[PDB]
Enzyme design. Sequence first.
Site, PDB file in Angstrom:
ATOM      1  N   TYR A  71       0.836  -1.200   0.000  1.00 57.94           N
ATOM      2  CA  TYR A  71       0.000   0.000   0.000  1.00 57.94           C
ATOM      3  C   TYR A  71       0.873   1.253   0.000  1.00 57.94           C
ATOM      4  O   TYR A  71       1.791   1.374   0.814  1.00 57.94           O
ATOM      5  CB  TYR A  71      -0.927   0.012   1.225  1.00 57.94           C
ATOM      6  CG  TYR A  71      -1.999  -1.049   1.183  1.00 57.94           C
ATOM      7  CD1 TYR A  71      -3.139  -0.877   0.396  1.00 57.94           C
ATOM      8  CD2 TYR A  71      -1.779  -2.305   1.754  1.00 57.94           C
ATOM      9  CE1 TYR A  71      -4.011  -1.931   0.153  1.00 57.94           C
ATOM     10  CE2 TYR A  71      -2.640  -3.367   1.519  1.00 57.94           C
ATOM     11  CZ  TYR A  71      -3.748  -3.178   0.709  1.00 57.94           C
ATOM     12  OH  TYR A  71      -4.544  -4.249   0.379  1.00 57.94           O
ATOM     13  N   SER A  72       0.588   2.185  -0.907  1.00 56.63           N
ATOM     14  CA  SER A  72       1.257   3.490  -0.892  1.00 56.63           C
ATOM     15  C   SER A  72       0.977   4.188   0.432  1.00 56.63           C
ATOM     16  O   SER A  72      -0.162   4.223   0.893  1.00 56.63           O
ATOM     17  CB  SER A  72       0.745   4.389  -2.027  1.00 56.63           C
ATOM     18  OG  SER A  72       0.924   3.806  -3.302  1.00 56.63           O
ATOM     19  N   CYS A 253       0.137   7.702 -10.840  1.00 56.91           N
ATOM     20  CA  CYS A 253      -0.231   6.653  -9.910  1.00 56.91           C
ATOM     21  C   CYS A 253      -1.713   6.322  -9.980  1.00 56.91           C
ATOM     22  O   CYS A 253      -2.557   7.202 -10.146  1.00 56.91           O
ATOM     23  CB  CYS A 253       0.172   7.047  -8.489  1.00 56.91           C
ATOM     24  SG  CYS A 253       0.182   5.675  -7.330  1.00 56.91           S
ATOM     25  N   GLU A 293       3.919   4.321 -10.844  1.00 58.68           N
ATOM     26  CA  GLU A 293       3.520   3.233  -9.969  1.00 58.68           C
ATOM     27  C   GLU A 293       2.051   2.919 -10.219  1.00 58.68           C
ATOM     28  O   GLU A 293       1.169   3.665  -9.796  1.00 58.68           O
ATOM     29  CB  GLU A 293       3.716   3.629  -8.514  1.00 58.68           C
ATOM     30  CG  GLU A 293       3.225   2.592  -7.534  1.00 58.68           C
ATOM     31  CD  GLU A 293       3.378   3.051  -6.107  1.00 58.68           C
ATOM     32  OE1 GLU A 293       4.529   3.160  -5.642  1.00 58.68           O
ATOM     33  OE2 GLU A 293       2.353   3.334  -5.456  1.00 58.68           O
ATOM     34  N   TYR A 295      -0.927  -0.343 -10.605  1.00 57.18           N
ATOM     35  CA  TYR A 295      -1.182  -1.640  -9.984  1.00 57.18           C
ATOM     36  C   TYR A 295      -2.580  -2.146 -10.284  1.00 57.18           C
ATOM     37  O   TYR A 295      -2.906  -3.264  -9.833  1.00 57.18           O
ATOM     38  CB  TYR A 295      -0.989  -1.549  -8.467  1.00 57.18           C
ATOM     39  CG  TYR A 295      -1.634  -0.344  -7.826  1.00 57.18           C
ATOM     40  CD1 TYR A 295      -2.963  -0.382  -7.405  1.00 57.18           C
ATOM     41  CD2 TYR A 295      -0.893   0.814  -7.574  1.00 57.18           C
ATOM     42  CE1 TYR A 295      -3.543   0.705  -6.739  1.00 57.18           C
ATOM     43  CE2 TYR A 295      -1.460   1.906  -6.906  1.00 57.18           C
ATOM     44  CZ  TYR A 295      -2.783   1.843  -6.490  1.00 57.18           C
ATOM     45  OH  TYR A 295      -3.333   2.900  -5.803  1.00 57.18           O
TER      46      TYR A 295
HETATM   47  C1  LIG Z   1       3.070  -0.343  -4.940  1.00 55.37           C
HETATM   48  C2  LIG Z   1       1.592  -0.605  -4.707  1.00 55.37           C
HETATM   49  C3  LIG Z   1       0.880   0.300  -4.064  1.00 55.37           C
HETATM   50  C4  LIG Z   1      -0.487   0.119  -3.816  1.00 55.37           C
HETATM   51  N1  LIG Z   1      -1.159   1.066  -3.178  1.00 55.37           N
HETATM   52  C5  LIG Z   1      -2.434   0.921  -2.885  1.00 55.37           C
HETATM   53  C6  LIG Z   1      -3.190   2.012  -2.170  1.00 55.37           C
HETATM   54  O1  LIG Z   1      -2.701   3.066  -1.775  1.00 55.37           O
HETATM   55  N2  LIG Z   1      -4.533   1.760  -1.927  1.00 55.37           N
HETATM   56  C7  LIG Z   1      -5.186   0.608  -2.327  1.00 55.37           C
HETATM   57  O2  LIG Z   1      -6.390   0.457  -2.103  1.00 55.37           O
HETATM   58  N3  LIG Z   1      -4.454  -0.331  -3.010  1.00 55.37           N
HETATM   59  C8  LIG Z   1      -3.144  -0.240  -3.284  1.00 55.37           C
HETATM   60  N4  LIG Z   1      -2.510  -1.202  -4.004  1.00 55.37           N
HETATM   61  C9  LIG Z   1      -3.167  -2.657  -4.220  1.00 55.37           C
HETATM   62  C10 LIG Z   1      -3.061  -3.371  -2.965  1.00 55.37           C
HETATM   63  O3  LIG Z   1      -1.731  -3.915  -3.449  1.00 55.37           O
HETATM   64  C11 LIG Z   1      -3.822  -4.702  -3.013  1.00 55.37           C
HETATM   65  O4  LIG Z   1      -3.502  -5.372  -4.261  1.00 55.37           O
HETATM   66  C12 LIG Z   1      -5.331  -4.474  -3.396  1.00 55.37           C
HETATM   67  O5  LIG Z   1      -5.764  -3.773  -2.215  1.00 55.37           O
HETATM   68  C13 LIG Z   1      -6.204  -5.710  -3.480  1.00 55.37           C
HETATM   69  O6  LIG Z   1      -5.797  -6.671  -2.429  1.00 55.37           O
HETATM   70  P1  LIG Z   1      -6.795  -7.625  -1.663  1.00 55.37           P
HETATM   71  O7  LIG Z   1      -5.993  -8.153  -0.728  1.00 55.37           O
HETATM   72  O8  LIG Z   1      -7.940  -6.749  -1.263  1.00 55.37           O
HETATM   73  O9  LIG Z   1      -6.901  -9.114  -2.283  1.00 55.37           O
HETATM   74  P2  LIG Z   1      -7.083 -10.101  -3.473  1.00 55.37           P
HETATM   75  O10 LIG Z   1      -8.025 -10.709  -2.512  1.00 55.37           O
HETATM   76  O11 LIG Z   1      -5.696 -10.543  -3.525  1.00 55.37           O
HETATM   77  O12 LIG Z   1      -7.501  -9.832  -4.918  1.00 55.37           O
HETATM   78  C14 LIG Z   1      -6.608  -9.511  -5.954  1.00 55.37           C
HETATM   79  C15 LIG Z   1      -6.865 -10.590  -6.971  1.00 55.37           C
HETATM   80  O13 LIG Z   1      -8.260 -10.752  -7.373  1.00 55.37           O
HETATM   81  C16 LIG Z   1      -8.311 -10.549  -8.802  1.00 55.37           C
HETATM   82  N5  LIG Z   1      -9.114  -9.337  -9.279  1.00 55.37           N
HETATM   83  C17 LIG Z   1      -9.007  -8.004  -8.889  1.00 55.37           C
HETATM   84  N6  LIG Z   1      -9.860  -7.187  -9.494  1.00 55.37           N
HETATM   85  C18 LIG Z   1     -10.610  -8.005 -10.359  1.00 55.37           C
HETATM   86  C19 LIG Z   1     -11.700  -7.741 -11.302  1.00 55.37           C
HETATM   87  N7  LIG Z   1     -12.322  -6.555 -11.520  1.00 55.37           N
HETATM   88  N8  LIG Z   1     -12.158  -8.788 -12.027  1.00 55.37           N
HETATM   89  C20 LIG Z   1     -11.616 -10.008 -11.801  1.00 55.37           C
HETATM   90  N9  LIG Z   1     -10.641 -10.395 -10.940  1.00 55.37           N
HETATM   91  C21 LIG Z   1     -10.160  -9.316 -10.237  1.00 55.37           C
HETATM   92  C22 LIG Z   1      -6.851 -10.823  -9.291  1.00 55.37           C
HETATM   93  O14 LIG Z   1      -6.589 -12.240  -9.481  1.00 55.37           O
HETATM   94  C23 LIG Z   1      -6.009 -10.214  -8.156  1.00 55.37           C
HETATM   95  O15 LIG Z   1      -4.778 -10.908  -8.056  1.00 55.37           O
HETATM   96  C24 LIG Z   1      -1.147  -1.059  -4.252  1.00 55.37           C
HETATM   97  C25 LIG Z   1      -0.361  -2.018  -4.929  1.00 55.37           C
HETATM   98  C26 LIG Z   1       0.958  -1.823  -5.144  1.00 55.37           C
HETATM   99  C27 LIG Z   1       1.695  -2.931  -5.885  1.00 55.37           C
END
Ligand SMILES: Cc1cc2nc3c(=O)[nH]c(=O)nc-3n(C[C@H](O)[C@H](O)[C@H](O)COP(=O)(O)OP(=O)(O)OC[C@H]3O[C@@H](n4cnc5c(N)ncnc54)[C@H](O)[C@@H]3O)c2cc1C
Length: 295
Positions: A71-72, A253, A293, A295
Amino acid sequence: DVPVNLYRPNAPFIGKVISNEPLVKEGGIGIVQHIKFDLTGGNLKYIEGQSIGIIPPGVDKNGKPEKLRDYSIASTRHGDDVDDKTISLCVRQLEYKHPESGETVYGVCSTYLTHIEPGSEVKITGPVGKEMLLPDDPEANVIMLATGTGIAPMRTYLWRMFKDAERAANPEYQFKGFSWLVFGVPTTPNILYKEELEEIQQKYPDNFRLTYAISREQKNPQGGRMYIQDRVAEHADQLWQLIKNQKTHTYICGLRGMEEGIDAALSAAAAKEGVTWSDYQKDLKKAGRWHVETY
Ligand SMILES: Cc1cc2nc3c(=O)[nH]c(=O)nc-3n(C[C@H](O)[C@H](O)[C@H](O)COP(=O)(O)OP(=O)(O)OC[C@H]3O[C@@H](n4cnc5c(N)ncnc54)[C@H](O)[C@@H]3O)c2cc1C
């Protein structure tokens, strides 16, 4: 000087939630929360533009522990209270479709975080990231292109730049350049931190410009919904002229796929002066003036 990996997954920092506030106003789409953690008791240091990891509880479908999600960081180095004791995040709850096994799917870590209670303990790792750092040059121009939760690093820059308490806390950095945020969200109640963004713009009309692309309320020239690539195309020649300044840094971003419409608009602008944008952009990345960045 840039702190990195002060905590790692094998021995994370255990922080405590201080607060969990909603950012999406009534009539908006989805759930985005502003979450503040207590850092006292540990030595987690960070600066603007970095990320931290969160390790959610529970096991996946194979019985294996859940990995960290990145998370950023949404606060400056001093925290929202400018006391050097906290860190904040901006987290959207992920949920989606029926073409993915069953009914509605809720993201593990983002659901966990958006419904977490004050007083709860969280596993935090990091910080990580050297790609989204802000120059200490107070005369830099800073272009900011964000969608949704991509506002998070932008908020750390802008607060460092324009908040009274920050200016009093950072004698070395008194910003006097120009900064421009183009912010793409679906509705007006989805403009994260709307009131504080607009307050900055009124105090510093010469140093900060704010542009929204609100897709459910605005239409582009072709009659479609207004997205951020539409606003960037709208101002392509201006953005290109600012990018030519040796002092200008651009930050992008948000969710992946916003980059393609931005390049197509800047290519057309650069081409007018015989410049090939994709070649120019490689030199900007090399120079450390192009920050991405998604994601
Ligand atoms: C550097 C970086 C910074 C980030 N900053 C932030 C931030 O500031 N705020 C924030 O909210 N998030 C941020 N994210 C994303 C955060 O990384 C998590 O990926 C995101 O919150 C979703 O995680 P989840 O655990 O809720 O789980 P998950 O339960 O892991 O779900 C993700 C998976 O479900 C699937 N999926 C997602 N969307 C869809 C869709 N529409 N249709 C079908 N399948 C889908 C994919 O297989 C994905 O791998 C950032 C990511 C990175 C890499």
